[PDB]
Amino acid sequence: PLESQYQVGPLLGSGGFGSVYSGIRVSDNLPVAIKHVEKDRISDWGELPNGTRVPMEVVLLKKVSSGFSGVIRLLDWFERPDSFVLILERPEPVQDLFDFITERGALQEELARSFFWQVLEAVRHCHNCGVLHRDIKDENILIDLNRGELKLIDFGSGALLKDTVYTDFDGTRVYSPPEWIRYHRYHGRSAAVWSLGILLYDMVCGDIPFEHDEEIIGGQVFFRQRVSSECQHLIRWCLALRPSDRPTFEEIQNHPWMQDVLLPQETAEIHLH
Numbered sequence: 001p002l003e004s005q006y007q008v009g010p011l012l013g014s015g016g017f018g019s020v021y022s023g024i025r026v027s028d029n030l031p032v033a034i035k036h037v038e039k040d041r042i043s044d045w046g047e048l049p050n051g052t053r054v055p056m057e058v059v060l061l062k063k064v065s066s067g068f069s070g071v072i073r074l075l076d077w078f079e080r081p082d083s084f085v086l087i088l089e090r091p092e093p094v095q096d097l098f099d100f101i102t103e104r105g106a107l108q109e110e111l112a113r114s115f116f117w118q119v120l121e122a123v124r125h126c127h128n129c130g131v132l133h134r135d136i137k138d139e140n141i142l143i144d145l146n147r148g149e150l151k152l153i154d155f156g157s158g159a160l161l162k163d164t165v166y167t168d169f170d171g172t173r174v175y176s177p178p179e180w181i182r183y184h185r186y187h188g189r190s191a192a193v194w195s196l197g198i199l200l201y202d203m204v205c206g207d208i209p210f211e212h213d214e215e216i217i218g219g220q221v222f223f224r225q226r227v228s229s230e231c232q233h234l235i236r237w238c239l240a241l242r243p244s245d246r247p248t249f250e251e252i253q254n255h256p257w258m259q260d261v262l263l264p265q266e267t268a269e270i271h272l273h
Ligand SMILES: CN(C)CCCn1cc(C2=C(c3c[nH]c4ccccc34)C(=O)NC2=O)c2ccccc21
Pocket: 012, 013, 014, 017, 020, 032, 033, 035, 072, 088, 089, 090, 091, 094, 096, 139, 140, 142, 153, 154, 155, 156
């Protein structure tokens, strides 16, 4: 049973992702996050190998939750008459990247490099597992403040990774690419790279680069903060208007700006502790 296995704590938050409570696993006091979503509020449904009807979020989480990674793992899930309940890892202490940047302002490039690298490795993991997140952004990244490790959250907008065109999108608009704005069409990997460019800009400038559709499709990138020439180049490459002009993940990680990355623990010691 659900209620015998987990001690539920206060509400952490709620929104389009359902209602998430702090909890602990009774067996070993493991900190967890307990996410509830009403069945009537689930738009995207899938099926598990054994043929169970579940939210697509569960399908995608199962696919990425094997072994260690920079994704928050699904530990268990339960079906109730009118809802699903997901048990997820919970770092402690933790802060999401949106709150971190809001509080501390634009990040030093050494810290942005460490964080961005970790996000790249996490998104590679997802893609390797056949999962497209589709909502990569500061709010969907948790920082484990003691370990210096970033963790991807909220697969509620995700999809199975495919090589053909996507014509649906329920992620965050300002992180959405110009081909979506113009044509309601995108491909998975190149749209992901766009969102990563937005994220990197957000890290080093302290705010996102575009607010309105006309800026997104204009793709003129103006920098509000001092950012190194190498970092500006990478950002501008990720934010190329034409999807085919954007770097691959390999190209991003081989970029001069991405060299000499700090390990998570040294990141924590230098920047977080
Ligand atoms: C802007 N926010 C706070 C969006 C949070 C999105 N979000 C965080 C979480 C998670 C956690 C949260 C960690 N702090 C939170 C505050 C509010 C809501 C959730 C959390 C967590 O520890 N593990 C998580 O998976 C989450 C889980 C499923 C779906 C969406 C989720």
